[PDB]
Amino acid sequence: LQSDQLLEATVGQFMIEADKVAHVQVGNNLEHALLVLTKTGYTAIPVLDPSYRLHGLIGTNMIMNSIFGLERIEFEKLDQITVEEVMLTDIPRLHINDPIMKGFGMVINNGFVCVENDEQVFEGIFTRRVVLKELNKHIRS
Amino acid sequence: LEATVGQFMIEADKVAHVQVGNNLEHALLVLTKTGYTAIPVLDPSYRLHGLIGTNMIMNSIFGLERIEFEKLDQITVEEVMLTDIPRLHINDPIMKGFGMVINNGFVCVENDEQVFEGIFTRRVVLKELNKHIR
């Protein structure tokens, strides 16, 4: 796109598509979430319900907060607690047709923002890296 | 502009850190409590040695058969930390920092003696860029 087109673009045109987004389910236990986070290398990822609607975010710090005990790391709790119980639910959301400037503003305070369609089906994530890389092209030239 | 990294960086005394020689359990506890996912590793001279974060800590104890939580207090941060990292000077132009945060959530600011001065974060870049577009 040319610079006089970037502001008119949509969030969906620059998001990471959902089939490339690591995620877990609300009903998974924290051991499964910790394995997915660690193996994919990400510090926080979306949490979906079985019908593919976003309900929250789960991250390593949330999980460790649940198992750092008084005397020891209580790793047995990883199999006893579900993602639902500790996930972050107050998160912003974008629509695939949202103007990209709405996404630009939301990533000031958020490393990524989840994107859904009009029926709340999860569609992908809008990340700071993609924003920064594209603004890279247009401030320069 | 003529704006510099030093005018927009998070100053060092506001930055969470650990020290070389600290073990991974301490570092993971600090990350968990502060809520940050990666922070600088300093020495007692306040020099920057690398970055430590939750992902690299978890990968260091992610075994074939089990998560080896008991190893966390047996491994020092310097055995796991990332050292091949970009660096900024306080007088660098803000656009040089902008380039460096494309691939990095933050970039450390330091002087020629490797003394740690602050971090240049994506958030401060994005706030200023939003001002410019808007």
Ligand SMILES: Nc1ncnc2c1ncn2[C@@H]1O[C@@H]2COP(=O)(O)O[C@H]3[C@@H](O)[C@H](n4cnc5c(N)ncnc54)O[C@@H]3COP(=O)(O)O[C@H]2[C@H]1O
């Ligand atoms: N495999 C990899 N290859 C190259 N660089 C990597 C990388 N993993 C992480 N990074 C770098 O680290 C930044 C912070 O990652 P973090 O996992 O904390 O934070 C990530 C993570 O929470 C989430 N995320 C990104 N891509 C994801 C994906 N495909 N699936 C799930 N979550 C993802 O969005 C946040 C912001 O991502 P963003 O790309 O802006 O920023 C990333 C990227 O610049």
Ligand SMILES: Nc1ncnc2c1ncn2[C@@H]1O[C@@H]2COP(=O)(O)O[C@H]3[C@@H](O)[C@H](n4cnc5c(N)ncnc54)O[C@@H]3COP(=O)(O)O[C@H]2[C@H]1O
């Ligand atoms: N206490 C808090 N208050 C408000 N918002 C908060 C927050 N903790 C995290 N966030 C938000 O989450 C983003 C990603 O944080 P993360 O810890 O993964 O990644 C952070 C962390 O690795 C590091 N960082 C930022 N501030 C730090 C500090 N004071 N001390 C140590 N490390 C810091 O720089 C990365 C990028 O930070 P940035 O501010 O651009 O982006 C932050 C910010 O938008």
